[PDB]
């Protein structure tokens, strides 16, 4: 059964057959659409029972992609995985399989607008890691390689898979590089309000907080199920960009800066039924992630009103669109600062344009591209980007990146 | 299965039980979400539909299972039996129309749902009669710029051969013409309809802002052209509160959004002609009607006049122009005392409406893909609001364009 999507701005129609290969559930039914739920339970322990069917499905996938489906290499590997499961209750991916699986988890990430780049992912195999110090070293190297002095390169570092769920590797940080947030007694917040809870855990674990507005948080790394340990990223590894505006000289005076490398570190990579609970991945920013969300979200730095004041806008009534007007300027300043400093960034027009090209190519060479419109459309100027008028089909393919509960809610403390 | 929606800006959690009363289907399955698909897809089935409607009607008036309810149920049951259809009482007609708007999950303006003015036009027999009812609707709803919400309901479908239809997609829309040098004058969204009207006997002035004639179909006959009296068409000249050169662009828009091509379903009955109107959200003109590439596409001209660097997208010249255009649209309407709401006020109103509906009704079906405005989405409160989308009845539905289905 085929399904079609129409771009209503160009009348281009595409035919999705890939959705038949879908296994996991969406959360929707015939009578309710959960398309705007941030985490369907579906999007968030496993025995030898249900494991070999998942392994077989992944290996069939993998050997098809190398055009060796049904070969002796394919059938022998199936048997080898079978015996390793029945005797060890898990199994180990070859290097080739791990690289393929990680690239395809990104290719499958239906909320990621940056997926045109999915095949150019540098995969770092950290499955020989055993300790938190070992994790810190792998992460430092990831940060150095990814940053590349501003010429950002996508990368992922994969720590050992889950076994009995009692020996998990976890990065307790939500991203490798994030700014601390401090709740003051007067109710205000210093730094990034998005990180107040994690900052407090860090301070509790012994971190001496500078209590500044842009303190890079320490790494809180959990190896093999042990209590997590604190490490400071060497500051020369943290590339940062002072935010200025090309016409507004007072903009520098807001004291703002941001870090160059977005490296998400709290998601779970699933490949052939194996669960990689620690797998930080990084690329480069779309400007709106910093300029719209990171600075202008009401629950974030919320510099909108200050920028509004310094522009001397009518802040009395909302219908003056002072918020809209200040948001654009803040996003101009983010792009201008990164480009001036030669730090890789992409604006939301370029990125959505690339994504449509990626999506059309995926429909032709792959039969489909799962896409989450609610997440693909940029958080400003939605309808003047090409993805707004693009119909999209959302479904869940494996390998996948999944959400998982924050470790501090599930961790059994050693003391 | 008593579902919960969370607002990630406020942490407010709402519990939705209203979805369990949902009947129609969304187009999604457990294996695929079609939440961004624009248009997903008689005798036997009529009495259950009527029962369901009358059950909810008599519940709303706190007389479920009373003398009146059971009597009306059999009365309708008898009429369907013989006549093969049935006729709504005035009271049920008004209830069904207010609740078809209440249930329109893509409508951000539903906090106003209970103040709808319903015009019963079920006695109309001709396109001329339809034109009379529509002029009265337009005059009432315009109200000299103090716009009022309104719906006019023409006779319900019978055999599909006697359909009442308004062929326009809105009562008031600007013409669009194909030009020699390839492009388009007027309004590109209306090029096919503008040529149908010409293909009917309309002498087009061939300007930018030519108000289209009405093309009215009664009882299934060929449609007829009618000119809306210009004194009934309120227009706003578009100028900018800071940029004096903006008036030089020669733009205007009409005050009354009156959508006329949808179908109103109440208790199984199908009202194929049911023009309804309210007032504009600024972005419906300034973002979509002016800046969409498939529309007026004046963005590049605005940013040019603003002397913005249009050589790279990363200057955000489009975004900068888009905001100025929408500031002007709001400034122009407000200066002329024509009702209009900005996207910040309307979305804030919609969160309050959602609050209300969960508290007094158990839920509110809401289509996030359509509720979030087409600009500045994440700084409006609906962006961070989880929503549940489901189809309740009475409802407004899509229907094919008549010129694809009418036997001439
Ligand atoms: C290289 C440039 C990249 C860009 C510009 C980009 C952009 C984005 C954006 C804007 C989002 C939406 C998140 C939000 O707005 O809060 C997103 C989601 C996401 N990105 Fe990408 N990303 C990039 C690279 C990558 C890489 C290298 C990976 C993994 C290896 C990745 C995996 C994801 C995932 C898993 C999500 C969430 C998807 C889901 O939950 O289905 N991205 N990305
Ligand atoms: C009075 C102020 C109103 C405002 C500000 C408003 C706003 C909107 C907006 C912005 C949309 C999205 C359409 C688009 O962006 O292209 C919409 C959709 C819609 N509106 Fe409203 N509206 C109002 C009144 C009404 C009334 C009076 C009715 C009917 C009685 C109505 C019925 C609908 C319907 C049926 C849809 C499409 C829903 C669907 O397809 O499921 N609206 N509205
Ligand atoms: C590699 C990469 C680059 C980039 N430029 N951006 C990225 C954004 C996410 C991301 C961000 C936010 C988010 O949502 C949280 C608010 C829960 C999720 C969840 N799927 C993923 C993940 C990876 C990204
Ligand atoms: C009374 C009213 C007021 C308003 N201020 N705005 C309105 C917008 C629509 C509307 C607009 C577009 C649309 O869909 C097209 C893209 C085909 C639909 C159908 N869902 C309804 C319908 C009624 C509206
Ligand atoms: C592809 C997408 O479904 C289509 O462009 C929709 C998206 N959301 C929308 N939202 C509103 N309010 N109005 C629209 O016309 C649309 N168009
Ligand atoms: C409620 C809603 O689903 C939630 O706020 C989502 C909406 N879409 C988003 N889209 C992107 N790109 N990033 C986000 O964080 C969100 N948040
Ligand atoms: Zn859905």
Curated annotation (Swiss-Prot), chain A:
Coiled coil: none annotated. GO terms for biological process: arginine catabolic process; behavioral response to cocaine; calcium ion transport; cellular response to epinephrine stimulus; cellular response to growth factor stimulus; cellular response to mechanical stimulus; establishment of localization in cell; establishment of protein localization. It is found in: Cell membrane, Sarcolemma; Cell projection, Dendritic spine. Disulfide bonds: none annotated. One of its GO terms (molecular function) is identical protein binding. Changing residue 285 to H: 50% decrease of nitric-oxide synthase activity. One of its GO terms (cellular component) is postsynaptic density, intracellular component. Produces nitric oxide (NO) which is a messenger molecule with diverse functions throughout the body. In the brain and peripheral nervous system, NO displays many properties of a neurotransmitter. Inhibitory transmitter for non-adrenergic and non-cholinergic nerves in the colorectum. Probably has nitrosylase activity and mediates cysteine S-nitrosylation of cytoplasmic target proteins such SRR. Inhibitory transmitter for non-adrenergic and non-cholinergic nerves in the colorectum. Belongs to the NOS family. This is Nitric oxide synthase 1. It comes from Rattus norvegicus. The gene is Nos1. The chain holds residues 299 to 718 of 1429 of the full protein.
